[PDB]
Design a protein around this nucleic acid. Structure first.
Ligand SMILES: [Mg+2]
Ligand SMILES: [Zn+2]
Ligand SMILES: [Zn+2]
Lengths: 1259, 298, 73
RNA sequence: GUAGG
């Protein structure tokens, strides 16, 4: 497996594939239920239905294989051969391929210079086309035919003159005879009127025939190839008048002849000529035409494949006609389409053998065209073949496309054996690598291993008896099972699996019941609630799979979340409450027996058991040797006249008993801690432990913390009751005062003194003030010993707004369709809302719920798009070859006389790599290629450095992918990234994970549409697709004088650049709210008005660095609005991916097209090649494009087809003949090969393991 | 869409009356005699042959005149017969086929209009098509008319009685037996698509709910392999000669077993010797010693 | 809101319209004095449509008998 | 189709 080349399939190849030829619509007999002869399912073309059984029965046994019986001709082999072998249908009248036409012009390609309507009215038998003309022959005999037509006109005029003479004679004769007769007064006048009416009619037909002669003559003078003759009567007239110099035809046959006689080389030359000197949209049309023509010219495949001649058929088992119980049947819809095409072809053949009219045969050929097209894709034209009438018919194309297509449901996401699922319950007695599996689940997962073990232990006599015993389920089987499951990892997994912590390995363990048991600490990483959930439990089998689950996917080696390098496996619901209750300042209860001095902790717990002491009370505690003192206690020490090293010996402190216990939980080497732990400080110390200790110790301390936290949370005694939540007493007074004020304003509105809109505006203001005031009063009232304050302050669970609306008035509630009411709710959930208050609360509740469902759909889609563009990048080099870097500000917002580190230094420069060394006082402070943590950054800012040159991926120059040195250190491991890691996929997952969590929207439009910029997730996608912003603000082109022209029709902005450059004029809406002064100096980068900048022009005018920094800043400020933080490397990967391509301009010497997308690498190679050749390099400009366009444009067709849009890409790849090499990830996942990312990489696969000679000597 | 274009293709053509149609038929027979004379191997004058050819061409033109005229009638009949499984437009084409057949077999000798003669052949062609290409599992014509007669008479029974008639009653009105009744009732069903919604708007297909049977169960396959190995082991435990003769008799190396005397050619023994050693082999293998390991296999 | 009666009325109306089309066709292809009420009609459309509504129709749903409250709601 | 996530 080295490539998958694809090209246009000619008729000869289709014949080669065929092992026969279909000649009937028959499938099976109605009474014998066996396949018929020479139709569909025929044994003689596809293969025997039963293993080695020929249809007649001449051969029925297995021994005599590889022979054909002369009775029915069936070849005896395995029935599975039917699944492969294919036949082919013949066509009496050629038809055209639907896919390559009736679409965008990037696949049709304008090969023949005709509008789509022309083809649509030729290849459906509605007009004529002139396939070929003897144009030279027509000019050779021009004088002769001209003379003949002149003679024809001469005799026409002579005959007409004779007709005039006869008419005049008749008129005179009848007039004379009737006036002589005198039958009535004026008979002569009446007959003369009749005669002149007859003359008029004869003249009318005379001019009509003259017209027909002149028009057929000028049409003859208007002969050329590729001319449509809509009027069939006209074409017939041409044919009767003249033949043997022009040939015309209808339907796909004319196109087939035209392509056969086509000369793509001459067309390519002409198109190059017009591209050299051409203007307008004609240049774009000639560009597309050149693109498609070049494709045929470069590739050996001939264009005649556009119009097929034989229709391939599927092997029958891919379209099974399975038998169902009850006498019914079942068939895939492809059978019906094949039957229709076969029937229509047969009837056309029958009608062609007998002399038949042109009308009927043309109609039948049109029907055949309609049928074959449906087979390629039903419903691409007119109305879809409905078949039974309740639904369309699934065609061939429909199986390769969409959510349910073959690509995205059967090559990427497959089903798998050795798996299970069940509800989950929390298990606190486990460790960080243990999970409980029910007996039945474990038994059914490990059945082969249990059977092998049973036979080895002699409980079971044989494999069959072992199977019988395990199915019976006797106690010996369960004992063997309990023996066998251990030291074997199982991968637990949850359904959404947003990020790579979704699948985690555990060591199993038997347990009664039927619900999995899981470790609480890891629950928050999955996002696994226990309301009611379910978790898949996959089982690795091979040695490699279990080894991987041991080393990589273990639940104990995934402390740090890769989004931002912070701990994720230390949840806080019930345990942080216990720890906070432990290390809490006094007043948490009545501090009984405080201030004493105790010999050691042991005496403290004995006193506590005695009940005199309280866990919260400041007392003096000694510590035996080996207890490291507090970090800040290092300077202070005891009082002595001799040197004393309290870093490692006895020392007395003032602290609480609970602080002593908490410190006892932590490792002995860890210094003391004497503050509240809460949620942030606990995360900080966990981060410190994960940084500075091996993994097993970290896990052990996490488990001790879990146990102690649960126990002390139980001891805490937090509750909720009627008296636990008390409304502030001051609420009623203040709210009634504000009600009085509101009533006064309502009264003064009743007199019309104030407008309704204004009244609503001030009510909003006053009630916002009132709700803020009551919130402050409630916050002041509640002590810190109240159960709720404990669980909200500690960081366990809850936010103060929920408390505000539980105990304080809920207040302003948005009305429907993003409006605000003037009368806020004046009650709390404790007090109890009223009816209309409940209704107007529901107004917002339902909208909130709807939003969440929609958000999941949008975030999921975004995450999918992100991965596909970013999949290719992989760290494929240990260290870079270059030195260029990227400048970052180390410390910003530096107050007067001091230096302050930036608030978000953690997500900007931490974990990067310093490319060049730094010297501020003549000495190195941060050595090169050393990461940036708290200590180094603190020292650097203390020295007073303002900016640094951090190495980063954008400037990284690596021949293969991107080196590890530039990428910095990963976040989930806390160490430099190993070679071959998939940084693209983790980047995309990190970007996409919080998309659900964004869940923010403009609270009120404010009555103006288009002013407020898109916010939240839409903004992000609007960022990541290069989409021009909804509210766009033009940017200054360059320095100069800017002024406003307020034309009545529409506002207008005009800036004349300085230095005499050309004046530049931009438009602007009437509602501007501009800020730049009129007739004033402007700078290059400044924006003209409020809105949102368009990335394209910033790239065009400023530079790639400007758009890069603007993009990362914009997305990061969007994200951190709610509070989510991600590192900048994740975004930088994608932002680098966007700009990889380039727009070639002035493609003169490069010889390829101008103004089309080009990979940067191929641009550089072509430029080097052409400058080496002596020709100048074609120019180029950076071009920012969305993630989607970029993914579709990827070189490998197979990966592109696996993306959302399939038909266009497959068609373009087919016409271009692009062989896809299997380098990449999404290309190799479908083939089932090893992804070249990490353990699958080459250098990591070709080692040999040998025991040492001394080891073999040891024995 | 396409049927609209075909009706347009019909467009406006001159309808036929008695005098016009009989004159056309006269030209038809004139041309038929002309081409008959042309086909004769006897030498004919060149100008005479061209005269015969042009009158034959004029007769062909008259033919197409009749067909283009009566397209409207045949599509009317197609409407009468459509909606029963086949496509409407295909029925129209089949009616056109019946029309060309009938006009090939019409003459003015009949003292009536076209509409009474052609319509019989149009009805014939449509009925044949509807009986031949309607059902996926094709039924033959005799059984097809059996099905339709049963269906219509059963509908008449429902209309009259208003209840489901007893099988014997239907058998009597049909005069067949109840066995043939259930047979024909089962023969008249229709396939149900595997791509049906399965009653679910999305994510489901009736084609992904029924398990196959060709697939080899790994459990049974490995059990068979262990059976083969254990039997071969116990077979080797016995004498190599006894082993070989039993193996060739029961065909443990090839699919087809060999007869007794069939073994007495390669091994050069008698048809009764081979029987004797086979018998004592069955006696030994019947011993409980070399049976236990084979008991669970059955 | 269309209640049950209106939906059933709409479906039986569609069935009876199909019946009218069929009987009009038959009348156009039937001889006078061979015409009776019991012969001209055909009961297939009406029963076909009413059964095609009561099965395989979104508004026709499976009763949920978890408890009487499920039934009511 | 409707429930639970
Ligand atoms: Mg949940
Ligand atoms: Zn055979
Ligand atoms: Zn690098």
């Amino acid at each position: 497996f080295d490539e998958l080349r694809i090209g246009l399939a000619t008729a000869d190849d289709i014949r080669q594939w065929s092992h026969g030829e279909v000649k009937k619509p028959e499938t099976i007999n109605y009474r014998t239920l066996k396949p018929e002869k020479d139709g569909l399912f025929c044994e003689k073309i596809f293969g025997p239905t039963r293993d080695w059984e020929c249809y007649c029965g001449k051969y029925k046994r297995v021994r005599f294989k590889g022979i054909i019986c002369e009775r029915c001709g069936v070849e005896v082999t395995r029935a599975k051969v039917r699944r492969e072998r294919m036949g082919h249908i013949e066509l009496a009248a050629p038809v055209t391929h639907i896919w390559y036409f009736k679409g965008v012009p990037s696949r049709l390609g304008y090969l023949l210079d005709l509008a789509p309507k022309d083809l649509e009215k030729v290849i459906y038998f509605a007009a004529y086309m002139i396939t070929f003309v003897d144009e030279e022959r027509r000019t050779r005999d021009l004088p002769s035919l001209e003379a003949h037509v002149s003679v024809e006109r001469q005799q026409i005029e002579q005959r007409r003159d004779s007709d005039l003479e006869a008419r005049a004679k008749k008129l005179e004769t009848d007039l004379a005879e009737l006036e002589a007769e005198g039958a009535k007064a004026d008979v002569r006048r009446k007959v003369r009127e009749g005669a002149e009416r007859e003359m008029k009619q004869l003249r009318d037909r005379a001019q009509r025939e003259i017209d027909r002669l002149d028009e057929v003559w000028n049409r003859f003078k208007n002969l050329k190839v590729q001319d449509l003759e809509g009027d069939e009567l006209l074409y017939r007239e041409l044919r009767d008048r003249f033949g043997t110099y022009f040939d015309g035809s209808m339907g796909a046959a004319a196109l087939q002849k035209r392509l056969e006689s086509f000369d793509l080389d001459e067309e390519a030359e002409r198109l190059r000529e017009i591209i050299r000197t051409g203007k307008g949209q004609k240049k774009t049309r000639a560009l597309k035409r050149l693109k498609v023509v070049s494709a045929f010219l470069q590739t050996s495949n001939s264009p005649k494949g556009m119009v097929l001649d034989c229709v391939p058929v599927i092997p029958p088992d891919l379209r099974p006609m399975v038998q169902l119980d009850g006498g019914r049947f079942a068939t895939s819809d492809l059978n019906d389409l094949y039957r229709r095409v076969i029937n229509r072809n047969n009837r056309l053949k029958r009608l062609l053998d007998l002399g038949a009219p042109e009308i009927i045969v043309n109609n039948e050929k049109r029907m055949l065209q309609e049928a074959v097209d449906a087979l390629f894709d039903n419903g691409r034209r007119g109305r879809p073949v409905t078949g039974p009438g309740n639904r369309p018919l699934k065609s061939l194309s429909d199986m390769l496309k969409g959510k349910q297509g073959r690509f995205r449901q059967n090559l990427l996401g497959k089903r798998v054996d050795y798996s299970a699922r069940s509800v989950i319950v929390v298990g606190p007695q486990l460790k960080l690598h243990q999970c409980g599996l029910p007996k039945a689940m474990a038994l059914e997962l490990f059945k082969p291993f249990v059977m092998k073990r049973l036979v080895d232990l002699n409980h079971a006599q044989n494999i069959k008896s072992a199977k019988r015993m395990v199915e019976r389920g006797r106690t010996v089987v369960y004992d063997v099972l309990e023996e066998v499951i251990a030291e074997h990892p199982v991968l637990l997994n949850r359904a959404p699996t947003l990020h790579r912590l979704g699948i985690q390995a555990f060591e199993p363990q038997l347990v009664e019941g039927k619900a999995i048991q899981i470790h609480p600490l890891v629950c928050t990483a999955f996002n696994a609630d226990f309301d009611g959930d379910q978790m898949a439990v996959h089982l690795p089998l091979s040695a490699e799979a279990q080894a991987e689950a041991r080393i990589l996917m273990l639940s104990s080696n995934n402390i740090l979340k890769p989004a931002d390098g912070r701990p994720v496996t230390m949840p806080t619901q019930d345990m942080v409450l216990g720890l906070f209750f432990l290390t809490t300042d006094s007043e948490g209860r009545s501090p009984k027996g405080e201030g004493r001095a105790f010999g050691s902790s042991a005496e403290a717990i004995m006193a506590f058991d005695a009940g005199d002491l309280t866990l919260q009370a400041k007392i003096d505690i000694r510590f035996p040797v080996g207890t490291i003192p507090p970090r800040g206690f290092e300077p202070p020490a005891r009082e002595e006249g001799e040197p004393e090293w309290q870093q490692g010996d006895t020392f007395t402190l003032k602290t609480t008993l609970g602080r002593a216990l908490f410190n006892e939980l932590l490792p002995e080497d860890y210094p003391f801690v004497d503050y509240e732990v809460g949620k942030k400080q606990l995360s900080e110390i966990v981060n410190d432990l994960a940084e500075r200790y091996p993994k097993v110790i970290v896990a052990a301390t996490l488990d001790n913390l879990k146990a102690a936290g649960f126990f002390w949370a139980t001891r805490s005694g937090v509750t909720v009751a009627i008296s636990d939540i008390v409304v502030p007493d001051a609420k009623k007074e203040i709210v009634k005062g504000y009600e009085g004020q509101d009533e006064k304003v309502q009264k003064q509105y009743e007199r019309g003194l104030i407008t309704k809109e204004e009244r609503t505006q001030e009510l909003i203001a006053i009630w916002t003030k009132a709700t803020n005031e009551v919130a402050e009063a409630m916050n002041d009232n509640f002590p810190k010993t109240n159960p709720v304050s404990m669980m909200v302050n500690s960081g366990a669970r809850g936010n103060m707004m929920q408390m505000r609306q539980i105990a304080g008035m809920r207040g302003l509630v948005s009305n429907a369709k993003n409006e605000t009411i003037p009368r806020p709710i004046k009650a709390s959930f404790r007090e109890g809302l009223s009816v209309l208050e409940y209704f107007i609360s529901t107004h917002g509740a339902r909208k909130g719920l709807a939003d969440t469902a929609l958000r999941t759909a949008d975030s999921g889609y975004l995450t999918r798009r992100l991965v596909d563009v970013s999949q290719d990048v992989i760290i494929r080099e240990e260290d870079c070859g270059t030195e260029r870097g990227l400048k970052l500000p180390i410390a910003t917002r530096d107050a007067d006389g001091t230096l302050r580190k930036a608030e978000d230094v953690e997500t900007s420069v931490y974990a990067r790599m310093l490319a060049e060394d730094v010297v501020i006082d003549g000495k190195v402070i941060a050595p090169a290629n050393v990461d940036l943590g708290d200590v180094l950054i603190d020292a650097l800012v203390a020295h007073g450095v303002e900016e640094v040159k951090t190495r980063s991926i954008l400037t990284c120059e690596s021949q293969v992918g991107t080196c590890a040195m530039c990428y910095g250190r990963s976040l989930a491991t806390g160490k430099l990234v190993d070679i071959g890691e998939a940084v693209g996929i983790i980047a995309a997952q990190s970007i996409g994970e919080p998309g659900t969590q964004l869940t923010m929207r403009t609270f009120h439009t404010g009555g103006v549409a288009g002013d407020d910029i898109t916010q939240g997730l839409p903004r992000v996608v609007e960022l990541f697709e290069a989409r021009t912003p909804k509210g766009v603000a033009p940017i200054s082109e360059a320095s100069g004088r800017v002024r406003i022209e307020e034309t009545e029709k529409t506002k207008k902005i005009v800036v004349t650049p300085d230095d005499g450059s050309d004046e530049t004029a931009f438009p602007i809406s009437k509602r501007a709210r501009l800020l730049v002064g009129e007739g004033d100096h402007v700078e290059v980068g400044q924006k003209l008005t409020v809105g949102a900048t368009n990335p394209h022009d910033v790239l065009r005018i400023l530079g790639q660095r400007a758009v890069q920094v603007h993009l990362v800043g914009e997305v990061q400020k969007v994200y951190n609005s709610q509070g989510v933080s991600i590192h900048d490397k994740h975004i930088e990967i994608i932002i680098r991916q966007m700009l990889r391509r380039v727009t070639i301009i002035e493609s003169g010497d490069a010889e390829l097209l101008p103004g089309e997308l080009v990979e940067r690498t191929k641009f550089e190679t072509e430029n080097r090649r052409v400058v080496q050749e002596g020709g100048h390099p074609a120019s180029g400009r950076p071009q920012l494009m969305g993630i989607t366009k970029a993914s579709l444009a990827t070189e490998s067709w197979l990966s592109a087809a696996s993306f959302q849009e399939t038909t266009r890409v497959l068609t373009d790849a087919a016409i271009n003949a692009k062989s896809d090499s299997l380098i990449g990830l999404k290309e190799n996942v479908i083939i089932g090969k090893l992804i070249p990312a990490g353990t699958g990489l080459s250098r990591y696969r070709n080692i040999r393991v040998e025991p040492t000679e001394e080891a073999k000597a040891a024995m | 869409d396409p049927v609209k274009d075909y009706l347009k293709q019909i467009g406006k053509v001159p309808l036929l009356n008695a005098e016009q149609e009989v004159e056309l038929a006269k030209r038809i027979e004139a041309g038929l005699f002309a081409e008959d004379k042309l086909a004769n191997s006897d030498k004919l004058a060149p100008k005479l042959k061209r005269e015969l050819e042009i009158i034959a061409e004029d007769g062909r033109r008259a033919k197409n005149h009749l067909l283009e005229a009566n397209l409207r009638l045949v599509v009317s009949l197609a409407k009468r017969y459509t909606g029963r499984g086949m496509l409407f437009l295909d029925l129209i084409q089949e009616g056109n086929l019946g029309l060309i057949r009938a006009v090939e077999k019409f003459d003015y000798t009949k003292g009536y209009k076209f509409s009474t003669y052609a319509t019989w052949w149009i009805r014939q062609a449509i009925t044949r098509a509807m009986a031949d290409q309607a059902r996926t599992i094709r039924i033959p014509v005799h059984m097809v008319e059996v099905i339709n007669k049963l269906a219509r008479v059963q509908r008449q029974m429902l209309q009259d009685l208003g209840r489901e008639p007893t099988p014997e009653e239907l058998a009597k009105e049909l005069d067949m037996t109840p066995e043939k009744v259930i047979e024909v009732q089962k023969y008249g069903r229709e396939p149900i698509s595997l791509h049906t919604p399965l009653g679910e708007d999305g994510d489901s297909e009736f084609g992904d709910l029924i398990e196959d049977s060709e697939a080899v169960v790994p459990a049974d396959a490995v059990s068979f392999t262990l059976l083969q190995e254990q039997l071969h082991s116990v077979l080797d435990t016995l004498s190599e000669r006894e082993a070989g003769v039993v193996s060739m008799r029961f065909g443990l190396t090839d699919g087809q077993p060999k007869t007794l005397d069939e073994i007495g050619k390669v091994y050069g023994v008698t048809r009764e010797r081979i029987r004797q050693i086979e018998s004592k082999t069955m006696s030994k293998l019947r011993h409980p010693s070399r049976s236990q390991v084979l008991r669970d296999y059955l | 809101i269309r209640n049950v009666g209106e939906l059933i009325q709409n479906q039986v109306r569609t069935g009876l319209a199909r019946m009218e089309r069929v009987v009009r066709e038959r009348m156009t292809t039937q001889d006078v004095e061979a015409i009776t009420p019991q012969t001209l009609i055909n009961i297939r459309p009406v029963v076909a449509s009413i059964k095609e509504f009561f099965g395989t129709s979104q508004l026709s749903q499976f009763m949920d008998q978890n408890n009487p409250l499920s039934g009511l709601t």
